[PDB]
Design a binder for this molecule. Sequence first.
Ligand SMILES: Nc1ncnc2c1ncn2[C@@H]1O[C@H](COS(=O)(=O)NC(=O)[C@@H](N)CS)[C@@H](O)[C@H]1O
Ligand SMILES: Nc1ncnc2c1ncn2[C@@H]1O[C@H](COS(=O)(=O)NC(=O)[C@@H](N)CS)[C@@H](O)[C@H]1O
Lengths: 442, 441
Amino acid sequence: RGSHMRLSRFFLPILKENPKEAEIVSHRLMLRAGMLRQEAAGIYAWLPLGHRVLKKIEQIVREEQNRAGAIELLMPTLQLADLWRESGRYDAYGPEMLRIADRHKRELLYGPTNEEMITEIFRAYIKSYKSLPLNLYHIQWKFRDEQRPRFGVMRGREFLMKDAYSFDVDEAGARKSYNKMFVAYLRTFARMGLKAIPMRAETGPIGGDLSHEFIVLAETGESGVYIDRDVLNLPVPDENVDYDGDLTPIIKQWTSVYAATEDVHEPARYESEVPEANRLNTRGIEVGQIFYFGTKYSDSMKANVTGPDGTDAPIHGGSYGVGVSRLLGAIIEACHDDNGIIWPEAVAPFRVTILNLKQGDAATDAACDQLYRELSAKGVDVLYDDTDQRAGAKFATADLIGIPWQIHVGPRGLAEGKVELKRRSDGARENLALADVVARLT
Amino acid sequence: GSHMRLSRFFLPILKENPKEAEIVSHRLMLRAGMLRQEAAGIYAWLPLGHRVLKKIEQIVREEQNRAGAIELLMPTLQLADLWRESGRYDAYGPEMLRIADRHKRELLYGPTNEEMITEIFRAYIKSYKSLPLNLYHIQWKFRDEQRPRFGVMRGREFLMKDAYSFDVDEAGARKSYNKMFVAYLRTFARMGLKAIPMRAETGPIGGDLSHEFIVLAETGESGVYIDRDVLNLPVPDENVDYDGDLTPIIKQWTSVYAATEDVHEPARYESEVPEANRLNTRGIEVGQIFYFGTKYSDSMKANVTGPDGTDAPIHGGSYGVGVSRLLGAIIEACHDDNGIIWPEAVAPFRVTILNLKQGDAATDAACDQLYRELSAKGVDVLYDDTDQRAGAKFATADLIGIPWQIHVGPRGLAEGKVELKRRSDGARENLALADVVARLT
Ligand SMILES: Nc1ncnc2c1ncn2[C@@H]1O[C@H](COS(=O)(=O)NC(=O)[C@@H](N)CS)[C@@H](O)[C@H]1O
Ligand SMILES: Nc1ncnc2c1ncn2[C@@H]1O[C@H](COS(=O)(=O)NC(=O)[C@@H](N)CS)[C@@H](O)[C@H]1O
């Protein structure tokens, strides 16, 4: 039943020109488009339009974890360092890690991740191979005290993550739980119109020899990559994919082609198997990573189950992160033109925006009032720019904040019974009837 | 229409009562698999409990937006400096989580957001034509409490809805207060709480006008002083005109004696209220409104240009709801010897299908069918398909507080009937299957 919003009733501080302080296109637009505000180095406030988007992103991620079988919960932001000496990653994050002391001086910390929290929870409740496979997950704020925070949401200190965690009896199991997630990630980024490409990766302080990062190609990458062009026509699986079945063929299908970050690149291995014309070397933004770590946290923390053969054994685990806040940036770094942002439909803070091209005119007002109420009812997320500005000004803002569809309402069109519908993508227009428009959009 | 099978879930039911849990809300939340303590006063929300938190979240959200307030989100960590800028730097004393990063800069884990929302306001809003404006967010606050007691009712890490209003004068802020007031009335009623508005001390937040919202209890931490008569009054309906005149709604809620344990004046309680009406009892505060005027705008130089062409600092208020606390309260108000009694609006599921002869071809098929069909009609449904005995399923269902239970038993099903049970009062009704999937819709 349709999100709805008049601009006179809102909080969108658009910015004149380009903030001295922003180095890349995504940070600039987000600042310009009234989405974001820095409150500290790498710590941001999410202003209402920006918050609106973050939610859309959240919900997609959620839906897809859920479709893959994972169960949501929420862990707290602060964790006892005690937990961390137990697995002994106490010093694994180093300077990058934020330690706190309470009013009783108790080694706490703002959690950069939750491998140890989730294991502690798993071991409290789950005792039998029957309970498995299990995949708990949350979408919660993390803090990494990055040395030099940059690029806005892209490299910040307080940031949002969906982190999930899988729990199987043995190796062959977890290799399945791994693939579920792998597929679910393929869909996730695709539903946000981004071709995120699976690439072999390095586990860092998270353990394991299996890990893929998902990387969207760019012209500003924290990481540089070497791929074969063809990895870009590969199909993604549709909503009816059976996660309960054998997923190997898709995984095969998504790895047989050369894909590598610069961390695990091998040129001698590469020129071997690409035609010289498909080679696209380029930079990319890591939007997520998936890890299999066997018994890292289960061994040294005693996360055992009694298995089908009678005896106790530590479970085989994995973990999987999606940069939910980083996705805002990455999406914009891959969906913009000189006029501003171009949101893909699923993530747009509104589907359509009504631009009243002569405010205060009884006719345009009545016509815009009605479209807005009709569009809301048909369950369409609608922004009505009822502010008191001129045609060019309204076109400028509408472009900038990258709403997918624009409806233009003005004197000479409406006198004849027609408005104009502008698709932001390519910028194509059609003159069409006021009756029509609402139907054609829904 | 949200859907879950218990054999696919994560629901760690606890047998007895955990010895470390004094009040019932807490101990139930733990039995019901809703919660784990990770540190004193700090919690992980287990799947069942998160569902509920989210439904509470959403109820607050809806009424806030109906009241015309606008949602953003502020970060958890704030800079010390901001607090110097206002002189609340010392205001939370030892209840303040004070951090330093790898650069020796002083951060703090926000116990509230009055300054920051001012920092954001002063940055962008310059003209009185931009007001009234109310900005709210739902976000984890922190208070290092002396000794964290009573589970989610008095933790250190908690979830709050903190809303903040901005007006040009005295008059414009009353207007904005009044709205939230009405909005808080509708909010808690939507959880099936009688939350009673009472005059309150403003503490570190400041102000000479503040109403605290209290549900009556016995094992509650606040001492309260009203007269019984308040408990009848109407709760404004979903169709109020917020833009219009609310004062004669505030008048019938303010105007019988409502006072907490502070601000309580006794040679002033016996007089304004007659003999048989008086009642010294206790409660659980679940939200507080504050009007503070220029406390923060003065100090942080947040001015707008007014109607006459001059600058002046804005008049503010703030409005909070202890979202995570409400779980406690609701349970404390909604329970019996058998478990929780979730109000329809906040229940993690509306109905639970209990298969009373698990693995049996008939009852299975009949359950697989109801399940698929309620989900299809958008009814949040939980199928307890656990390989377990009848008594156990009844027990659990009761424990976790789902408002409706569907009992599918072999004899009952052998003739097209299934028993529907309302958890409130244990009303039952033997119904045909077609009958059941409707009805509940
Ligand atoms: N400083 C940061 N700012 C923004 N996003 C980040 C930051 N650090 C990580 N991310 C995002 O979060 C994702 C998960 O990060 S990760 O550390 O590589 N993997 C993990 O933490 C594992 N626990 C998987 S749950 C990253 O792929 C990236 O998209
Ligand atoms: N330690 C705590 N644990 C759980 N809930 C709390 C805690 N402290 C306060 N709350 C809830 O949060 C509500 C608002 O808190 S407050 O401190 O009175 N108000 C404020 O902080 C306002 N500045 C925010 S608008 C309280 O009415 C209470 O129900």
